[PDB]
């Protein structure tokens, strides 16, 4: 077994990466570009300069639906680990409405509005922060 957030970083180009409850789930190649407005994605991007230094671009989409918390804690662990990985990268924030040139440009139909989850996918429920009451 191997940690994921640490496995980040095996090849350039870009990755696609769902967060969950610190879990990290691979979005399915199948759609690729599918997106759950409600939790939280995390994005990768390498790019290469002449041919030997590398850039990682930092873009984590936020369909607007997904509470501050799991929001930011994505930002938060994509960036830091950043750091971890290269030590500056860059910084997209998609807040769902005003997202970036880059963004739309790698993802041109990459924008599939979809209530639900993966394992609330069976149920069919999308729980609202009033859980917490």
Same mark, same amino acid.
């Given at each position: 077994? &191997?940690?994921?957030?640490?496995? $980040?970083?095996?090849?350039?180009?870009?990755?696609?990466?769902?967060?969950?409850?610190? @879990?990290?789930?691979?979005?399915?190649? #199948?759609?690729?570009?599918?997106?759950?407005?409600? @939790? $939280?994605?995390?994005?990768?991007?390498?790019?290469?300069?002449?041919?030997?230094?590398?850039?990682?671009?930092? &873009? =984590?989409?936020?369909? #607007?639906?997904?509470?501050? @918390?799991?929001?930011? +804690? $994505? +930002?938060?662990?994509?960036?830091?680990?950043?750091?971890?990985? #290269?030590?500056?990268?860059?910084?997209?924030?998609?807040?769902?409405?005003?997202?970036? +040139?880059?963004?739309?440009? =790698?993802?041109?139909?990459?924008?599939?509005?979809?209530?639900?989850?993966? $394992?609330?996918?069976?149920?069919?429920?999308?729980?609202?922060?009033?859980?917490?009451?």
């Amino acid at each position: 077994e &191997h940690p994921e957030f640490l496995k $980040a970083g095996k090849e350039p180009g870009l990755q696609i990466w769902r967060v969950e409850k610190f @879990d990290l789930v691979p979005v399915p190649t #199948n759609l690729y570009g599918d997106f759950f407005t409600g @939790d $939280a994605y995390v994005i990768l991007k390498t790019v290469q300069l002449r041919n030997g230094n590398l850039q990682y671009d930092l &873009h =984590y989409w936020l369909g #607007n639906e997904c509470s501050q @918390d799991e929001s930011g +804690a $994505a +930002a938060i662990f994509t960036v830091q680990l950043d750091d971890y990985l #290269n030590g500056r990268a860059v910084q997209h924030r998609e807040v769902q409405g005003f997202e970036s +040139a880059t963004f739309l440009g =790698y993802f041109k139909s990459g924008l599939k509005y979809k209530k639900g989850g993966v $394992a609330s996918g069976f149920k069919h429920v999308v729980p609202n922060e009033v859980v917490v009451q």
